Amino acid sequence: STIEERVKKIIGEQLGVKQEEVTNNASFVEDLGADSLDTVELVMALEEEFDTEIPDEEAEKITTVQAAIDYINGHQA
């Protein structure tokens, strides 16, 4: 597989966090410990996987796993 599983797998891989810790409610910065960089790497890894481009300040407002899943479902073509 599902979008949720692939998104959580990529989040764990990029952030170096265990899968069980990657809950839908988890915040990348406040819950997963991402820095001013992990935003970059995670955003671009998801942009590659699902072949979609998001404006930067829109990605800055995507703060949680569920928000990323939501955007991917909403915009993937």
Binding site: E30, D31, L32, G33, D35, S36, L37, E60
Partner: protein
Amino acid sequence: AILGLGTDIVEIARIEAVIARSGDRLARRVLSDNEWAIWKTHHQPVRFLAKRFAVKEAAAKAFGGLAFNQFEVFNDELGKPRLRLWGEALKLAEKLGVANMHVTLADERHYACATVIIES
């Protein structure tokens, strides 16, 4: 008119070592009551504590009377850090004629850094 300028850099693993040695005394000395309440339940208290420490030390130098327990850091609606003063800290700010406070914060995997400018 710039009234004061301060900067700081913090090695995060070093903070983690301090927590390993003395537990919560560092956070107890640097954080206000609110910030302590937040720290008790944070997922990565090392990073939170490092970032707060950087900002607050930068502010202390910018003022160059300021107690870590009398001023706390908060994020406004734009996500930008902002200073909140009370007690003798606020008294000092009013004495110096501080009209605006500017804070910026960045942190990496190994380091946190912050800069504060106080201006009239």
